[PDB]
């Protein structure tokens, strides 16, 4: 009986769990995830296939941030307490996620449809008005923090 209980206690000691929680929290704090900044970012990329530098339009929002939220949204009920700054960042990211995902899907769809249009140059002249209004809407949005 005592040998068995010693075996089980040793196994349980090997079966501790908090250390990984601690390491993950430390990694989160070190990496300093965030979303604050511009509504979306315009960047420079030299896409292979063309000599020029393409100013492809992206969204200032890492899709992985929500993952962190879910971790917290789990670890909180797991009984492990996470630092208040991390709680705040995860909560803000979770509440703000829907807007970001709608934005990114919308901009990707717009890019796909505009490249489809310009693939057929015979039609861009007609669609120019819609492209103008969309560009105006993007121009209005981009200035926002």
């Amino acid at each position: 009986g005592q040998k068995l209980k010693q075996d089980g206690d040793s196994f349980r000691m090997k079966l501790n769990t908090q250390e990984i929680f601690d390491d993950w929290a430390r990694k989160v704090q070190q990496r300093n995830l965030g979303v604050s900044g511009r509504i979306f970012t315009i960047e420079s990329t030299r896409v292979r296939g063309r000599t020029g530098n393409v100013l492809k339009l992206k969204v200032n929002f890492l899709p992985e941030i929500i993952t962190l939220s879910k971790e917290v949204r789990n670890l909180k009920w797991l009984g492990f307490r996470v630092p208040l700054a991390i709680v705040n960042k995860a909560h803000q990211a979770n509440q703000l996620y829907p807007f970001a995902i709608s934005l990114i899907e919308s901009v990707r769809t717009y890019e796909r449809t505009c490249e489809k249009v310009e693939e057929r140059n015979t039609i861009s002249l007609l669609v120019a008005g819609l492209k103008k209004e969309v560009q105006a809407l993007i121009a209005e949005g981009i200035a926002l923090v």
Binding site: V54, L57, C114, E118, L125, A128, I138, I142
Partner: peptide, 21 residues
Amino acid sequence: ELAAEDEQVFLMKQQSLLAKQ
């Protein structure tokens, strides 16, 4: 008539605006 204003020019202009803001 309506103009196209190629996406690259608009993108670079707004890149400049974001840089300066």
